[PDB]
Design a protein around this nucleic acid. Structure first.
Lengths: 141, 57, 221, 99, 185
RNA sequence: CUUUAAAUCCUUUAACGAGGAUCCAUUGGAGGGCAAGUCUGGUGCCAGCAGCCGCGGUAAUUCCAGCUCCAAUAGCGUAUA
């Protein structure tokens, strides 16, 4: 505190309000432009169906290609790119099929060597990818 | 080699070894008893540094 | 398993004349011999290592590496010490940390929270030390609470012997050497704080030299 | 060194533009263009010039971007031309190393 | 507007440090010494001991010679005497904070069954309580986390329906008797 | 038998009801943070793992499998405010 007076609270409150407004997390969490530009619309999960299966490489130090998928969302038709999570799961996902897609764990940012993408697929055709992985349940066809 | 865009080569070329039958593991309260016994009851005093429970060197 | 005391203090300690180390702390003699504390404090002086980190000075042909070991030693009923030694290998760095920590050892005082019943268990007041950018507070706690801190000052105050503390650190805490030296400096200055419990004027007892000058002129040149 | 042959999922290619960012574009034998992204083991040790025969794999899920596998010297290129695994339309136009 | 309770609370707390050597060694020592099932029990004993210590500290920070201090202090001391974790010699408010998890753990029914001599081990005491063999003041107890009071210590004996203290023999006795009748003809 | 408007469930109580007591406990992890193998085979900057540093280049303490081990335990992991 700098202005310390017995009859000074409105000045302190207004200055604290302005300096709290002039932030990053509070400015993102209390403005509508971020949620308007948010594809999920401030939600944990979203549905979508598959446009096509594409491939993108990694960054400079790591040399591999990561096989994401192109899914557009159902709430508002935003076309995003979601990363198919685990090994060999690109056979299970098909073109024009419903998927359940969630974030990857950095509040809407790219994670590691994958470029730009920030979402992952959790379930395809209302069955989980973990059940298709561990040999516990078979997908309908 | 075949191709590079093929997926699951390591999973599709893994030498599939089935699990062998083992005796069931005690669970609930007896596992805490066995852990307490093997960590605090039949231990010998040791100098230097203590090896881990899986140090198979 | 041998000792040749090169100093006058070593000869006085060896010849069964100076009773404890408390009067040596009282007159504030520089203890330039390591094994005076070994002779006074026996097997209760337990040691452990804090961190062995490498430092590198680069030369024309590659870079030369040295290892420095932070080691704290102390007795669980009072005295605590801390020592840093940088050498070539690791084992003699640990031994150098042992000898330099046993050189630099200080006593602590313990007080009470609120009520004075039984043995003292916590720090007498709010004491604070500082080295680098690290600021460490030691605040008294009620009986039976326990030390709440990072693990390194927690083990430092347990080897100090205090049962109850409240702490609040600030700065680059991850530098373990600066944090350990700041906690050691915070706990070392408890005898540098004046309290109304000891406002009375201390009677000036004589130095052990003043009574053992005859013994030292018999045993020395 | 050795005469490597292709397999199901790979074909040959001829470089059209030698481009930056670790990528280029090369034709197939029928003229379809696949965006070649170079393999990680062929980034600094070997160097790929313009209008030379290379080995480029294909994709089993899309046709938008391919990957380079290997490169061949000029003598083995004209030896592969002499066998007749490619039609009589493609000309190497005398590419080799200088002296 | 249904007429229900909607009142509940958590009785245990989880420490902020999940992986430390000395903490896991201490709870493993407590569990293996006193034959408990999981760390949720010692966590809930730590929680109720922290609540009692917080209440005693809140009473100690209030000034002397006040009716609320005396009322809740004497209520807490009478309660902890009734549990049996204290004696009448240490009947003081500042002596509450010098307690331990050990004193709250000795008052378990499982510990008293093992200590008096009904059972041979603490785990045998637990499984002996679980099969309904131990009764106190003419009421059987099937649960190991029962806190016995100081006056309830001398009433511990075997049940009138358990075969250990006199009653109908169990399933293996009658089956082995029928097997002996079949073998004898 | 009891409960209940009539029931169900709890408790009481019959006759049956276990020795690999198959009446078989999962969820994550094992480089550091952070508790726990420089174990054994396969791929060889490919497939992939990894919240972060980073691990994969034909001897991988990190990929994929077997054994052992660690964490919480009828619960555990993940995405979001």
């Amino acid at each position: 505190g700098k202005c310390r007076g017995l009859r000074t609270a409105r000045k302190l409150r207004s200055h604290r309000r302005d300096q709290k407004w002039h932030d990053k997390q509070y400015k993102k969490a209390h403005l509508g432009t971020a949620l308007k530009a948010n594809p999920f619309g401030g939600a944990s999960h979203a549905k979508g169906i598959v446009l096509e299966k594409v491939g993108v490489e990694a960054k400079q130090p790591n040399s591999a290609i990561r096989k994401c998928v192109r899914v557009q969302l159902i709430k508002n038709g935003k076309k995003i790119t979601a990363f198919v999570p685990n090994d060999g799961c690109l056979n299970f996902i098909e073109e024009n099929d419903e998927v359940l897609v969630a974030g990857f764990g950095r509040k809407g940012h790219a994670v590691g060597d994958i470029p730009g993408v920030r979402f992952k697929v959790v379930k395809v055709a209302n069955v989980s990818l973990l059940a298709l992985y561990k040999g516990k349940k078979e997908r309908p066809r | 080699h075949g191709s590079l865009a093929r997926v699951g080569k390591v999973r599709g070329q893994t030498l599939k070894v089935a699990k062998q039958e083992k005796k069931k593991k005690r669970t609930g309260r007896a596992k805490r008893r066995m852990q307490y016994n093997r960590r605090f009851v039949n231990v010998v005093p040791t100098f230097g540094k203590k090896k881990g429970p899986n140090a198979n060197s | 398993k041998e000792w040749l005391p090169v100093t006058k203090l070593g000869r006085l300690v060896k010849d069964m004349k100076i009773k404890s180390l408390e009067e040596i702390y009282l007159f504030s003699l520089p203890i330039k011999e390591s094994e005076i504390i070994d002779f006074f404090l026996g097997a209760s002086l337990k040691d452990e290592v804090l961190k062995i980190m490498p430092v590198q000075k680069q030369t024309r042909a590659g870079q030369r590496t040295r290892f420095k070991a932070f080691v704290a030693i102390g007795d669980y009923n009072g005295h605590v010490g801390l020592g840093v030694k940088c050498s070539k290998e690791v084992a003699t760095a640990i031994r150098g940390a042992i000898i330099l920590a046993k050189l630099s050892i200080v006593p602590v005082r313990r007080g009470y929270w609120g009520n004075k019943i039984g043995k003292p268990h916590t720090v007498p007041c709010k004491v604070t030390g500082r080295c680098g950018s690290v600021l460490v507070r030691l605040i008294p706690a009620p009986r039976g609470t326990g030390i709440v801190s990072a693990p390194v000052p927690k083990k430092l105050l347990m080897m100090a012997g205090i049962d109850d503390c409240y702490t609040s650190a600030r700065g680059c805490t991850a530098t373990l050497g600066n944090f350990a030296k700041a906690t050691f400096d915070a706990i070392s200055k408890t005898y540098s704080y004046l309290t109304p419990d000891l406002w009375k004027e201390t009677v000036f007892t004589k130095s052990p030299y003043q009574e053992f000058t005859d013994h030292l002129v018999k045993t020395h040149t | 060194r050795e005469l490597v042959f292709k397999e199901d999922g790979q074909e040959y290619a001829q470089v059209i533009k030698m481009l930056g960012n670790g990528r280029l574009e090369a034709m197939c034998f029928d003229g379809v263009k696949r965006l070649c992204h170079i393999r990680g083991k062929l980034r600094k040790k070997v160097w790929i010039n313009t209008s030379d025969i290379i080995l480029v794999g294909l994709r089993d899920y899309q046709d938008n971007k391919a990957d380079v596998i290997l490169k061949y010297n000029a003598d083995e290129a004209r030896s592969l031309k002499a066998y007749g695994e490619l039609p009589e339309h493609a000309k190497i136009n005398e590419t080799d190393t200088f002296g | 507007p249904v007429a229900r309770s909607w009142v509940c609370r958590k009785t245990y707390v989880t420490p902020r440090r999940p992986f430390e050597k000395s903490r896991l060694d201490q709870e493993l020592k407590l569990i293996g010494e006193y034959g408990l099932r999981n760390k949720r029990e010692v966590w809930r004993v730590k929680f109720t001991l922290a609540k009692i210590r917080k209440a005693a500290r809140e009473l100690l920070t209030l000034d002397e010679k006040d009716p609320r201090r005396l009322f809740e202090g004497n209520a807490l001391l009478r309660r902890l005497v009734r549990i049996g974790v204290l004696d009448e010699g240490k009947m003081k408010l500042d002596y509450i904070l010098g307690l331990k998890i050990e004193d709250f753990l000795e008052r378990r029914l499982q510990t008293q069954v093992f200590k008096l001599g009904l059972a041979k081990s603490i785990h045998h005491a637990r499984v002996l309580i679980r099969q309904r063999h131990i009764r106190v003041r003419k009421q059987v107890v099937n649960i190991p986390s029962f806190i016995v009071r100081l006056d309830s210590q001398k009433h511990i004996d075997f049940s009138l329906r358990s075969p250990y203290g006199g009653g109908r023999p169990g399933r293996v006795k009658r089956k082995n008797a029928k097997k002996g009748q079949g073998g004898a003809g």
